[PDB]
Each structure stands twice: as C-alpha cells, then as structure tokens.
Design a protein around this motif. Sequence first.
Motif, mmCIF file in Angstrom:
data_model
loop_
_atom_site.group_PDB
_atom_site.id
_atom_site.type_symbol
_atom_site.label_atom_id
_atom_site.label_comp_id
_atom_site.label_asym_id
_atom_site.label_seq_id
_atom_site.Cartn_x
_atom_site.Cartn_y
_atom_site.Cartn_z
ATOM 1 N N UNK A 7 0.838 -1.191 0.000
ATOM 2 C CA UNK A 7 0.000 0.000 0.000
ATOM 3 C C UNK A 7 0.876 1.245 0.000
ATOM 4 N N UNK A 8 0.355 2.341 -0.543
ATOM 5 C CA UNK A 8 1.085 3.603 -0.544
ATOM 6 C C UNK A 8 1.315 4.093 0.885
ATOM 7 N N UNK A 9 0.444 3.668 1.797
ATOM 8 C CA UNK A 9 0.563 4.020 3.209
ATOM 9 C C UNK A 9 1.764 3.344 3.860
ATOM 10 N N UNK A 10 2.253 2.280 3.233
ATOM 11 C CA UNK A 10 3.348 1.497 3.793
ATOM 12 C C UNK A 10 4.716 1.963 3.308
ATOM 13 N N UNK A 11 4.737 3.003 2.478
ATOM 14 C CA UNK A 11 5.992 3.509 1.928
ATOM 15 C C UNK A 11 6.946 3.950 3.033
ATOM 16 N N UNK A 12 6.395 4.542 4.089
ATOM 17 C CA UNK A 12 7.190 4.998 5.216
ATOM 18 C C UNK A 12 7.911 3.877 5.944
ATOM 19 N N UNK A 13 7.214 2.766 6.161
ATOM 20 C CA UNK A 13 7.787 1.627 6.871
ATOM 21 C C UNK A 13 8.795 0.875 6.001
ATOM 22 N N UNK A 14 8.678 1.026 4.685
ATOM 23 C CA UNK A 14 9.519 0.279 3.753
ATOM 24 C C UNK A 14 10.635 1.126 3.148
ATOM 25 N N UNK A 15 10.552 2.441 3.333
ATOM 26 C CA UNK A 15 11.461 3.377 2.673
ATOM 27 C C UNK A 15 12.934 3.111 2.979
ATOM 28 N N UNK A 16 13.253 2.934 4.257
ATOM 29 C CA UNK A 16 14.628 2.668 4.672
ATOM 30 C C UNK A 16 15.145 1.382 4.040
ATOM 31 N N UNK A 17 14.273 0.383 3.959
ATOM 32 C CA UNK A 17 14.621 -0.896 3.359
ATOM 33 C C UNK A 17 14.840 -0.767 1.853
ATOM 34 N N UNK A 18 14.094 0.138 1.226
ATOM 35 C CA UNK A 18 14.206 0.358 -0.211
ATOM 36 C C UNK A 18 15.513 1.059 -0.569
ATOM 37 N N UNK A 19 15.963 1.957 0.304
ATOM 38 C CA UNK A 19 17.236 2.644 0.107
ATOM 39 C C UNK A 19 18.389 1.650 0.155
ATOM 40 N N UNK A 20 18.224 0.615 0.973
ATOM 41 C CA UNK A 20 19.232 -0.428 1.118
ATOM 42 C C UNK A 20 19.346 -1.258 -0.157
ATOM 43 N N UNK A 21 18.296 -1.231 -0.972
ATOM 44 C CA UNK A 21 18.270 -1.989 -2.218
ATOM 45 C C UNK A 21 18.771 -1.161 -3.396
ATOM 46 N N UNK A 22 18.911 0.146 -3.189
ATOM 47 C CA UNK A 22 19.460 1.016 -4.214
ATOM 48 C C UNK A 22 18.643 2.259 -4.519
ATOM 49 N N UNK A 23 17.525 2.434 -3.821
ATOM 50 C CA UNK A 23 16.682 3.611 -4.021
ATOM 51 C C UNK A 23 17.402 4.884 -3.583
ATOM 52 N N UNK A 24 17.610 5.797 -4.527
ATOM 53 C CA UNK A 24 18.327 7.036 -4.247
ATOM 54 C C UNK A 24 17.393 8.241 -4.211
ATOM 55 N N UNK A 25 16.095 7.989 -4.338
ATOM 56 C CA UNK A 25 15.123 9.075 -4.366
ATOM 57 C C UNK A 25 14.477 9.304 -3.006
ATOM 58 N N UNK A 26 13.936 10.501 -2.834
ATOM 59 C CA UNK A 26 13.382 10.919 -1.561
ATOM 60 C C UNK A 26 11.902 10.484 -1.486
ATOM 61 N N UNK A 27 11.504 9.999 -0.310
ATOM 62 C CA UNK A 27 10.220 9.323 -0.078
ATOM 63 C C UNK A 27 8.983 10.076 -0.599
ATOM 64 N N UNK A 28 8.797 11.323 -0.176
ATOM 65 C CA UNK A 28 7.595 12.080 -0.539
ATOM 66 C C UNK A 28 7.653 12.587 -1.977
ATOM 67 N N UNK A 29 8.778 12.363 -2.656
ATOM 68 C CA UNK A 29 8.849 12.606 -4.096
ATOM 69 C C UNK A 29 8.228 11.419 -4.818
ATOM 70 N N UNK A 30 8.187 10.293 -4.116
ATOM 71 C CA UNK A 30 7.573 9.078 -4.627
ATOM 72 C C UNK A 30 6.084 9.052 -4.290
ATOM 73 N N UNK A 31 5.768 9.200 -3.006
ATOM 74 C CA UNK A 31 4.382 9.330 -2.573
ATOM 75 C C UNK A 31 4.249 10.338 -1.438
ATOM 76 N N UNK A 32 3.451 11.373 -1.673
ATOM 77 C CA UNK A 32 3.188 12.389 -0.664
ATOM 78 C C UNK A 32 1.691 12.531 -0.430
ATOM 79 N N UNK A 33 1.236 12.209 0.790
ATOM 80 C CA UNK A 33 -0.181 12.338 1.144
ATOM 81 C C UNK A 33 -0.653 13.787 1.086
ATOM 82 N N UNK A 34 0.262 14.721 1.329
ATOM 83 C CA UNK A 34 -0.086 16.135 1.390
ATOM 84 C C UNK A 34 0.636 16.973 0.341
ATOM 85 N N UNK A 35 0.810 16.417 -0.853
ATOM 86 C CA UNK A 35 1.484 17.135 -1.918
ATOM 87 C C UNK A 35 1.603 16.357 -3.212
ATOM 88 N N UNK A 36 2.361 16.917 -4.150
ATOM 89 C CA UNK A 36 2.561 16.306 -5.457
ATOM 90 C C UNK A 36 3.691 15.285 -5.425
#
Lengths: 700, 698
Positions: A7-36
């Motif tokens: 779920x998009x709501x789970x991005x926060x709990x998974x974000x740190x783990x995703x960075x460990x896999x190679x994600x170099x992008x910032x979380x709320x640039x991917x999904x932001x509940x209060x923005x673009x």
Amino acid sequence: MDEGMWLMQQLGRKYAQMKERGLKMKEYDLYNPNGTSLKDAVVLFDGGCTGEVVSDRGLVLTNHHCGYDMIQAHSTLEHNYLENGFWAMREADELPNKDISVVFIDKIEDVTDYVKKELKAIKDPNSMDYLSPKYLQKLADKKAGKNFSAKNPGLSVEIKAFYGGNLYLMFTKKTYTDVRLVGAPPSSIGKFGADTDNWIWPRHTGDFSIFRIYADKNGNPAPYSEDNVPLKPKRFFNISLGGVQENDYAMIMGFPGTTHRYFTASEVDEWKSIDNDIRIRMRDIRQGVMLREMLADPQIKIMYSAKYAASQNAYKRAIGANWAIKTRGLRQNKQAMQDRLIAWGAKQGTPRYEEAVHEIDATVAKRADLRRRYWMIEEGIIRGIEFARSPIPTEDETKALQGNDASARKEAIDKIRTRYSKFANKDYSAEVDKKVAVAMLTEYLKEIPYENLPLHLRLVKDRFAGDVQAYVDDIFARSVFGSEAQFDAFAAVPSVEKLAEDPMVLFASSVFDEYRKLYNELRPYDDPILRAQRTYIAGLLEMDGDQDQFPDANLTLRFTYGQVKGYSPRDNVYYGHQTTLDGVMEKEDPDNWEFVVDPKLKAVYERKDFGRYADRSGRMPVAFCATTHTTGGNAGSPVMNANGELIGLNFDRNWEGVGGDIQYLADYQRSIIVDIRYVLLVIDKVGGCQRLLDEMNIVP
Amino acid sequence: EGMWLMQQLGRKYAQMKERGLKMKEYDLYNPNGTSLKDAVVLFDGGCTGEVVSDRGLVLTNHHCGYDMIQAHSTLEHNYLENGFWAMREADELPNKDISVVFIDKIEDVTDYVKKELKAIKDPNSMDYLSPKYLQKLADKKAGKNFSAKNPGLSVEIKAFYGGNLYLMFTKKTYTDVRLVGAPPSSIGKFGADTDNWIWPRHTGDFSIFRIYADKNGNPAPYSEDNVPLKPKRFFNISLGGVQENDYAMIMGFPGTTHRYFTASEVDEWKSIDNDIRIRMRDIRQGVMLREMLADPQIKIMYSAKYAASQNAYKRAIGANWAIKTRGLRQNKQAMQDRLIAWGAKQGTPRYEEAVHEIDATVAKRADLRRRYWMIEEGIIRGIEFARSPIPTEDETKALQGNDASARKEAIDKIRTRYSKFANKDYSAEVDKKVAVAMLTEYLKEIPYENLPLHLRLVKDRFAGDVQAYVDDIFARSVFGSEAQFDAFAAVPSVEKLAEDPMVLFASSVFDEYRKLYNELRPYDDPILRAQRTYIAGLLEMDGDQDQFPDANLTLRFTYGQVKGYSPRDNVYYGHQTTLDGVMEKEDPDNWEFVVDPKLKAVYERKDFGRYADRSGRMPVAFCATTHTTGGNAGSPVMNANGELIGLNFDRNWEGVGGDIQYLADYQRSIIVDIRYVLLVIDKVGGCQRLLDEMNIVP
C-alpha cells in the motif's frame, strides 16, 4: 527489501529498506499524502490496465494489448492501423475513443476507525456488510457529503476492504474520459510473441501504445468535444536512456488485480485437487477433440481459432499453478504459517485463531463433493459444450406462444431467432460440437453418478442404453435448433408443446437447473469462511506485524520493488536479465504470422541505426525482467529508476510466476518489462514521430 | 577444430598442453611402444569402446550394446527394460557376430602406394580408392603368410585427404566379447527421442562388456575354454570430476565428415538432400501422428517407426539451420576462392579447373539426384507396401511350369515374406493413408515422363484420383489382406500374380530406384578425382597443421574444453547437468521420461557416496568443445592426466553441420559423466565386483 504489493501508506515503513536496495530518491517525491508526487503520474487505464503520464501535455503510455481494441476500432481493411501501426503527426490527428477512461488516484485516506464505528450499529454479529461494496459506498457518500457529485466535477469517492475486512481505505478518484489514440507500433512489434511466447521469458515483444488525456480549458474532466484541450498533468515521468544493468534497483507502481496469499493449507488442496485438476482434465479433452478437427479442416481452423485459444488460457494457467504447488511447496508454507499463528495464539491465551483455521478446514471439507460436481458441470458442460448455451424460451416467451391470441406471438419468435443465429453463428459447427459433446459427456457421465446427474442425461441409461453418441445424435436430429431448416420449419408453424419437449431445450434447461442448484447449495459456505478469514488475518497482522506483510491485491494502487535479474528455469539452463534486437531477428519467420518482422525494424538492425538508444556494448535492448511482485492488473505499469526515472514498461509475467498469486516465488517469478529505450527506438526509427520525443523529458 | 590422425600428435602436442594437457606425448600415442591408444577399441564395427580394467572390461554406450542386450532378453526376465548385471564372470553372456578391434600399429605408406600407383595405365582409374586394390597392396607389403605368422593380426590400407595420403593399419581383432553389465532402459535411454541431439541431456548412456581370449591372450572365437583377456593397457578412472574450462580430449572412430566440400556441394546438400528428406518425412510423420493419436494400438504398432523417421529428420533440420545461420556455403566459397587466386599467381590452373569440374558435375546430376531422393524418401522409405513381397525367378517357375509339389513350396515361401510384411505392427489402412499423402506430393514433384511405370496409371486409368488408385491397389491384390492371400494360395496362378497391382507397384518403384542409382554413380568418379587435386592444392597452399583429413572410420583424437554455450539470445546452457534435471523431467505416463525406482530412492536419500561432486549434487552428464561425429559413440573422454572422466554418446543439433564446418560457439560433444556411470553400477546395479576390478583414482 521485502517482495510484495505494498500500500502507498506502507511507503514509510519500507522506505529505509528500499534505500538499502538502491533507491536514491526521496520518499515524498515518490508518494506524498499532502502534496505532489510520482504517484500522480500513474493511472488506471480503461478499468483493467495501468498507465503513466509521460509528458506535460497529457501523453500516456500503456501496453499494446491494452490499447489493442481501440487500435482495432480505428482500423479498416484499406487503412489498417492494427498491422501497419498508427502515428498522428499532429495533435489534431489523434483519434478519439468511446467507452474509454483514465483514472488518477488523487487522495488516499485510512478510514478503518470510521468504518468500524459505523459497523457497530450491529443488526447481526455475522452480517456481511463489512465486505459489501454497496454498503461501503453508502459509508463513502456519507463522509464525502450529500452532492460531492456536483461540488467536485470529475471526482468520485470509494471505500474498499483490505486484510479480509480489518482495514479500510477511502480513495478520491479523478476520471477523464476523453483519451485519444496517439501512437501504436505494428502488430509485428507490439504482438511479436503472440501466443507461443505468451507468459514466456525470454521475450522480444515491443508491447506498448501511446495515448493522450484531453480535458477542458482548466484541466477538468470532460467528455469528447472538439474544443477540448490536452491535459497539463500535475506530474509526469521523466524518460531515462541510461538503461539497466544486472542487479539494478527497479520499482513499479500499478493496480494489481487479485491475490490469495492468506489461503489456508486446505484451500490450497481444494484449489489443486478440485478447481485446477478438473479444469485441466476437462479442457484437455475439449481442446484435444477441437485441435484434431482444426488440423483436418482449414475452414474449421479459422472458425474455432479464437475458442481454442481462449480455452487454452485458463488451461495453461492451471497447469502452471499445479506445477508451483507441487515443486515450490506452496501448501507446506501455508501450513507452516497457520501452525505458527496457532502456536502463538496458544501462548497468548487466545484460542479464536485456531478456532478460525479449524472453521475454514471443516467448511472446505464439507463442501468438497458439491464443489466437485459444480466444477465438473461448469468445465464439462457449461463451458465445454456449445449447445448447452443453446436458446431457452423464457417464461414470457412461452406465455406469448401458448394460449395468447395476439400476434406478439411472432415477436417472441423474432427474439428466439436472434438468439439462435448468435448460437449457430458463422464460427459454429454442429458436427464439431457433436464430437466435442460426446467426448465431454462420456467423461462427465464417468465421474458423475446417475443420482447426481441433471435430470436429462439420465436418458443415456434409461433410453439410449448407454450410447452417448446416439443420445447426442437424437438431440440434433429431432430438435428445432439442430439446423437452419429445422428452425425455419418451427418458425413457420410454432407450437409451445414442440418447444416444451424439444430434446436440446430440455438438455440446456436441465444442465442449467443443476448448475444453479449446486451453486445455491454451495453459496452458504462462503460467509463462514470469510468471517473466519477476518479473524485469521487479524491474528497474522498482530503476530508478524503490519510492515513485513501486505494485503491481497484488489485493483488498488500498490508499489513493488526489486532488482533487474534473470533466473534458472531448470537444470543447467539460465535465462539472462535482458533481451536484445538480435533475438528478434533470430526468431524471424516469414511463414508465421506471429514472428513476422517489420521491414523498417530489420533495416534499423542491419544498419545499426540505434542512435543513443543502444547500450555500451553497442547492442539494442528490447526487454528486461525484474524480481518485482506483479500480477494481472499491472498490465501497463511504469518501471522506475533509483531516481524515479522511467526505464521500462511492464507488460507480462513468466508462467512460472503464476503461483505468485498465492506465494511470491523468489527464484522463478519475474516481471516481464519492455525497455523504454526500445520504445523510443520504435517511435523514432519506425514511427518517425519526432514530435512525441521532443514532448518527453529525457535525462542523460 | 580437428579430427587428427595419431601421426599429427607430435605437431599438436605443444598446443594441447598450452590448452591444459599435462601428460607425456608417448604415453598418449607411441608409434613404437605401449600407449593409452592401445586401450581404445572399435566396438562392433560401428561404435567406440575402451578397455577399463586389467581383465578385459570394456565400456561403451547403451545404444551401442542395445542389440545385444535385447538378444538375451527373453519373454519376461527382460534385461532391456530392467537391466542386466552378471554377479560373476561365469554368467557373462557371450554375443555372436560381435567384434572388438585394437589398432596395434599405424604407419605411413603414401610413397609406397603412390609408386605402385604410378604403374597403372588409365590415368582416370579409381584403383587409388579401391579397397580391393589397396588390400592387395597391404598383403604385398605385410607378406603373403602374415596372418598365419602373426596370430590375431590383420593388415589394411586406407586412403586419406582424397587420396593424397595413405596409412597402413595393423589390427588385432577379438570376437569373444561377452555382455557384463547394463543399466535399465529408463536410465540408458532417458533422453530417448525427445532429447536426442539435445543439450542439456540427462541420459546415462552406457553398457559394459568383457573381452575373452585363449590361454595366451590371443584372439579366438567363442569357447567356454576362453579366458578373460589381460590387456597391455587400460584406462584409469578418475573421480575428481570436471569443472568449467577443464581440458578434455577424446580418442575414437569418427565415421564421415565433409570438410572439403565446395560451395555448390553445400547448396546441393541443402536444396536436394536435406529439403526433400525434411519435406517428405514431415508429411509421413504427420499422417502417422494423426493415426497414432486416434487409436491407442496404432500408437503401439507405429511408435518405433515414427521415432526412427524422426531421427534423420531432426538431423536434417539442424543441418539446414547451420547452413542458413552459420554461413557454411560462404566459408566454402571463400576457401576455394583463395586456392584459385593462389593457383593463379603460381601459373597453375589445375586447382581452378578441379573446382569447376566439381561444380559442373553437381549441376548436371541435379535433376537425377532430385529424382533419386524423391523416390527414396517418398516411396522406398516413405511407403510400406513398396517393400511388399516380390515373386522371385525360382518361385515364378514352379507355380508356373506345372510339375511338382514344389509349387506349394513356392507358396509357403511367398506366404512367409507376406507374413513378415503384414506383421503385428502393420496396418493396411494406415499404410493406405500414408501412401495417398506421399504419392500426392511425389506426383506433384515428378513429371509423367519421369514416373515409375505403374504410378503413371493415376492419370491414365484413374481420373487423377490418387485415393482410388491406392484403393484399387489394396483391393484386387493378393497381398491386400489375409483373406485375399489365402484365396490366391488355394488357387495359385502366375498370370494373376504377375498382374497384381501391388507387385507391379513395388517392382516398378524399385527398378526406377535402381535405375537412378546406376545412372548417378558414374558422376561420383569425376568429383572424386577433382577432389584429389583440390585437397592437394589446399594442403600445399596452407599446410599440414590446421587442416585435418575427412573422417573414414579410423582412429582419431580431438581435444577441447568442458564448456557450455549460448543457443540463442539471453539463453545459456551450462557445462554440466545434474540428477536434479532427471527428476524435473520425470513423467510416469511417458515411457521416455520414466525415472527408475532405485535411482529415485538414491536421489531422495542423497545416497551418492564418493560419486558426488564438491557441493553435494550428483552429476549426470557434461559437454565439451571437442570435435566429434557419428562413430564417436562410446568414446573415452580423458582429463589432463589421461584418466577416464566419461563417455561421449551424442552431439547437440546445433553442431550437426560440424561434419562440414566446426562451429566453436555451438558445437558440443555430449558426454555422460563417469561418476554417474559408477553410481548406476553401485547403487542401482549392485555389482561391486566391477568397481573393485577397475583402477579408481580418488
């Protein structure tokens, strides 16, 4: 680093783990509940596919097979876009579509507490309103407002259930219906694999199509009108030509359809020994007879090509599913999962979890014979035998022909004639249908005892002395729908009694009576299972946590991540992570409509005219595969870089990964993705539509 | 890459160690002493085998000893299906018409043969390739009473390089070779038809024999006084196994190659030989497949026939793939063009003329060769009742002549051949349908004026109706059915038998078959003589080191590396297969992929002993870059020390065109792992006496 449909709501709990896999992008640039965020560039395409906005003028990318019917609609014999491709050289030449829609997920909100509160207005402790979409829509309209309809044009609201009813999300949807065809490769590229390379990796199919969202002057959703203007999206994907390497980070946003990861062990057994086994057995007989008739007669082949291929689809899926069950040990892991909850529940001092699992087990075992008879008649007769769906006179068609003096008499016959002509159409063959029926009925009569048969088919024992062939022959011989002449004879002098005793009508009615009776007798077994599953999943959530597990797919926006990686399908064989244009040429077969290669493409290949689309080695990539978790619904999902840049377009899953709907298969399940460099190659060198390239935003 | 003569070992020995060989040259092959060469045998005139122990134990392929395993397979204690394992040397079963051949000595007699040749009148004489003439030369050089003065030894001279090289072979032949051990067919033929010419392969293709001789180790026919031969050399068996890029080498007897074909001969090979075989067999197999699927006993009757046809059919497919994708024609065209340019600058036109002579001969025989392959594939091999019984001259005169009960003698002789023709695996209705399809194609490709005299009745007597023609043949015919034969057998009249539509058919398709053969063979000699000049030109131009003579069932060696390959884009086949693959392919309903119960139990228990590799997985087969062809079946595969690491038993279909041109990126020899062989002997055969008698190096 977990594999699932999060779920998009789970991005926060998974974000740190995703960075460990190679994600170099910032979380709320991917999904932001209060923005673009990048989510705003993902769309639900035509209700069943995924798409993505690619330019700031509403350019939308999806699969070729997703836009297939629309390309076909704008295709004529003279000017055939389906085989030659389509490329509007200006925005005005883009072709409008009817019955098309695109859906932005503008806002997602957790309303679990709200829904649960409204549910404590209990009428009945075991009421199924908590899963009722009708009821949830009323809860949806209530929170949104009276006429949210008019206050917000283009916006709609929906509430869906997750985790067997332990979590509820509210979605605010933005629906555009003016979506026009922009670009499309020839069938030789977008459908290059056809049916023989379907669900197969490696793959060399340029599966894509291009569209554009239109709206009014302010960008608000509006039906088709010549005064509509291309949508300026809130967000769109950037195109990357940096390509992919082995073990490169890859992630996907889309709308996966259905999974069943919380099945009990008994449910896996049921799926295998009843659903799949009966489907495999009955269809192998049907396809076997059908195949034999198609080869012997080239005319039968062109008539039954679609019916044959259609039957093959779920057939192959059932084969792959049972392969996964037998070799991947799906049953055992479900059995380990529920045993772990039971042991945990006992230590906790709460037996309701063990009680729920037992409830499911006992219900599955109880309905086994009824479910067997259901699938046997559904696969065997309802789906297997064409004249099972022969015309049946309605109640008010009977009354109108019976002692009814008015000559609406005749109007009822016209309605019957229309249904007969659709049944006995240009693709229908009575002789082929007869042979299929005899084979299918023989197997059905073998498995189903006399006492459980429909009330016809008993006549094979009582009247035809066991002769299935004579039984089928007698049907077509003395029936009204047996042939064109036999129907016209009835239409000339129609009598209610001749229809009431018609051998084919009696058959079709009898098999459908039993079909509905078994159905009505099986349905009250669903509710106790669902209620138990709610308790089961609730326990799993409380035990294993809400971070390292995900809810079943339900046509809801999810994200999945992994790496670009091949796999080993069998002993001493390894499939790599990336296919090339070389592979297309190796498969070239002029005599096979499937593997026909477009002349312009081959010229590009032979001249090495790849521009900046080829890799370092100088090779032209076509497709690549990733360890992401996808299923039906992720049809046209965007595949992103470590920096959220579009690197490809998902379009399929390998057949080994069909078991992924029950359990993710790390060493076998792979998402099949067409390289975006290959997409841009076709647009540039084959389509010559330069305006589309200038419109996109391409990074180094 | 090379099928080298034993004489060329000295030249290649440097390169062989450069690619991994660590073994002294003269232990591999010694022209004047005992070497590892003396442990290699020609098995039963067709396969290759190797001496494995110091008591005459011989290893070869399972498909090499297939005929002999079945020959001892009774009614229902069948060794062919269950396997065979003699628990002592006393119950090892002798085989008649079996043979084992050692190559005792090899010497160059080129100058001797040539000076004997420069003593014959006709410059176009073919005696330089005649085995009769070459043998008489061999008997002369060896001595009149050689065989009598040398017990067990015989001598033979063979031509190499199109007649530019002659070798003399001294052969020691044993004919007392008994069957010792054999795995079940489920293991020995696990790949069967589906996986033939296919890598990865999971076939334990081996069988075990033993050589017997008299009290002094000299050759002798079958006798119960015979004692197991004590060989002067046998292979050590390695358990170290193989790894990727490991050095590997093979000794054996490759049958035939065609490295020195012209570009036109390649075109001829594709457009005529392969295309006709592919087209005709596809039609035949198609009809058979339809009838087999419809009737389960037809499936039983035509299972073997269908499989047999597919064999060369698949090989033809692979060959044409190579010609189309690997550009074999272009390489031959470039090869001959180099010689032409080279011969031009030397003022020697004889090489260019030789090439043109070959091209001209191929061109002129094109139509005739097409008709030959059309009738051989289409009718002779394509239609069953083409081989229906034909009344000989001595039975015609008996039934006719009217003067004995020798008349009835002739009938039962005809009845015998008819019963053999119309046996348990024969269906008249299936043969009918096949015929109609095959003849339909044949009558389309062969004009009226070139038809077998009986086939032109489909136009003359029938309205172009092939079905009616075939129907009329099986009706009215003495051999159409059993009832129609007994009617003839009761009232035998020659004027009826001589007018039988089935006899007329069979006789007229065969005399046309032979007529084309006799008309085509005079075209062989010009090509051969021109080939002698061509190859001699190629040898003089480039040298004696990077060109090997075509295979001719003589002992050769080849070397390479244990390595896989990429068959297609984004796909790679590794170098080694495992027992896991056997279980992955298991299908109890398909006789081809039936996994043996004991073998299955061995896998489940992980009972591999010392035969497993350093990982815990059981090896089955591996592949190498060695250059082999038909005849190399059962050849010993050696590691860097000359130790046995397996047996060659096949070749991948991508390497079928290797007989014309070796393909480094595709061609691989398919080899059963010797570790897997010992596993089957041990944990499946239970024949420990075989393990102990071998010299195993741990």
